[PDB]
């Protein structure tokens, strides 16, 4: 994507993406509003299994859109299974979407409520061998989405917050070993699920979304550090990395199912 020019500005933001990525107007785009009254309990959903005890983080990268905490996905270490999923999905990275103000930032909404931010733990289906092959399949990825609200600090997030000073600008990375993603989970694994897409270009319709009902709390100081990151590269005019979220897309011919 060396000739990609999409972003979150007025001239290159979500309303423009369809010109280079026509699937932006597709039949299973993400995110969506979760209408809690219309979502139906599905007693057939199997238990959700988040097995992160052997997770091996490697690095954190500012990619000019968000920051990714990257994992070693060359063995079954950190895996997601159960719930709506058939087979085994390996954790490759997590990242966040967040706002300029606490009243916006999430991609999914709940009865039109926007949270301050949203965490995406990205996993790929091991039956397709590599992430690049998985994104070409309708059941290639499983993204576990977790809402953030501003209140108490999340102790398990602080190691991420403190390293951000070293990856301020696009293209900067830092070693980020021994980070435990279990420290970012809420108590309950109750969730909603639906078939959708990547929420950034290339917007591929390859994702089973699993969105947890219980948000995690982070402090105002933690999210303020996210908002000091830059979309720009070093030695370019400063553009704060804020409002890096896609709004809700049409649900079209989809049902959202509840685990609870």
Number of residues that bind ligand O42 (CB under 6 A): 10
Place of tokens 């969105």: 211
Per CB under 6 A, 258 contacts ligand O42: no
Residue showing the smallest CB distance to Zn ion in the complex: 120
Among 29, 125, 199, 244, binds ligand O42 (CB under 6 A): 199
88 is in an annotated binding site: no
Cβ neighbours of residue 140 under 8 Å, at least 6 residues apart?
A: 124, 125, 128, 133, 134, 204, 206, 207
Cβ proximity to ligand O42, 102 vs 205, nearer residue: 205
Cβ proximity to ligand O42, 39 vs 121, nearer residue: 121
Per CB under 6 A, 170 contacts ligand O42: no
Compute the least distance from the CB of residue 238 to ligand O42, in Å.
Answer: 24
> What distance lies between CA 113 and its chain's CA centroid?
17
Per CB under 6 A, 143 contacts ligand O42: yes
Cβ neighbours of residue 226 under 8 Å, at least 6 residues apart?
A: 96, 98, 117, 161, 164, 241
The site map against ligand O42 for 75-114 (x = CB under 6 A) is: ----------------------------------------
DSSP letter string, 11-25: TTSTTTGGGT-GGGG
State the virtual CA torsion across 207, 79, 109, 105 in degrees, nearest 10: -100
Please give the residues from 120 up to 139 whose contact with Zn ion meets the rule CB under 5 A. 120
Per CB under 5 A, 28 contacts Zn ion: no
Q: Is 65 a catalytic residue?
A: yes
The gap between the terminal CA atoms of the chain, to the nearest Å, is: 40
Tokens of 142: 């499983």
Stretch that binds ligand O42, among 32-40, 154-162, 200-208, 237-245 (CB under 6 A): 200-208
Distance in angstroms (rounded) separating the CA atoms of residues 244 and 182: 24
* Contacts with Zn ion, residue ranges (CB under 5 A): 120
* Contacts with ligand O42, residue ranges (CB under 6 A): 120, 122, 132, 135, 143, 198-200, 202, 204
Residues contributing to the annotated binding site for substrate: 199-200
């Amino acid at each position: 994507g060396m000739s990609h020019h999409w972003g979150y500005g007025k001239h290159n933001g979500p309303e423009h993406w369809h010109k280079d990525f026509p699937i932006a107007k597709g039949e299973r785009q993400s995110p969506v509003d979760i209408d809690t009254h219309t979502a139906k309990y599905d007693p057939s959903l199997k238990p959700l299994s988040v097995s992160y005890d052997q997770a091996t983080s490697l690095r954190i990268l500012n990619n000019g859109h968000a920051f990714n905490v990257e994992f070693d996905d060359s063995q079954d270490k950190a895996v997601l299974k159960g719930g709506p999923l058939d087979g085994t999905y390996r954790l490759i990275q997590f990242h966040f979407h967040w706002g300029s103000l606490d009243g916006q930032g999430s991609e999914h909404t709940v009865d039109k409520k926007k949270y301050a931010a949203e965490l995406h733990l990205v996993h790929w289906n091991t039956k397709y061998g590599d992430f690049g092959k998985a994104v070409q399949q309708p059941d290639g990825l499983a993204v576990l989405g977790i809402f953030l609200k501003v209140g108490s600090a999340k102790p398990g997030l602080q190691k991420v917050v403190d390293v951000l000073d070293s990856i301020k600008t696009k293209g900067k990375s830092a070693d980020f070993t021994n980070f435990d993603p279990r420290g970012l989970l809420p108590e309950s694994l109750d969730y909603w699920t639906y078939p959708g897409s990547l929420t950034t270009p290339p917007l591929l319709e390859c994702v089973t979304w699993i969105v947890l009902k219980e948000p995690i709390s982070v402090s105002s100081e933690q999210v303020l550090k996210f908002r000091k990151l830059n979309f720009n590269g070093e030695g370019e005019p400063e553009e704060l990395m804020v409002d890096n979220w896609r709004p809700a897309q049409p649900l079209k011919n989809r049902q959202i199912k509840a685990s609870f």
